[PDB]
Amino acid sequence: MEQNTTQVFSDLAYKVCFKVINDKNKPFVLHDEQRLANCLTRYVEAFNVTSEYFFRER
Partner 1 sequence: DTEVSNHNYTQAVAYLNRATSSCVKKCDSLNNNGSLSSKQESCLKTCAENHAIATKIHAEYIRKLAESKYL
Partner 2 sequence: TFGELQTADDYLHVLQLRSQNKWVKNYWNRSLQETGKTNKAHVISPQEQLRLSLINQYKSLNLSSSIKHNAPFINRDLYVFDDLFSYNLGDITTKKSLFNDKNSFLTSYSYLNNNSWNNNEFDLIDNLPFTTLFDNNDLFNNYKSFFQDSIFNSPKKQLSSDSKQLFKHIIYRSIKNNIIQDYTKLVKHEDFDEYSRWIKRS
Partner 3 sequence: QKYYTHMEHLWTVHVNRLNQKILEDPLYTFYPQELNVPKHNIIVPTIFRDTPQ
Residues that bind partner 1 (CB under 8 A): 10, 13-14, 17-18, 21-22, 25-28, 32-33, 36-37, 40, 44
20 binds, among partner 3, partner 1, partner 2, none (CB under 5 to 8 A by kind): none
22 binds, among partner 2, partner 3, partner 1, none (CB under 5 to 8 A by kind): partner 1
Q: What is the largest CA-CA distance in the chain?
A: 47
Helices in 1-58 by DSSP H: which ranges? 2-21, 30-54
Q: What are the φ/ψ torsions at residue 26 (nearest 5 degrees)?
A: -65, 155
State the number of binding residues for partner 3 (CB under 8 A): 5
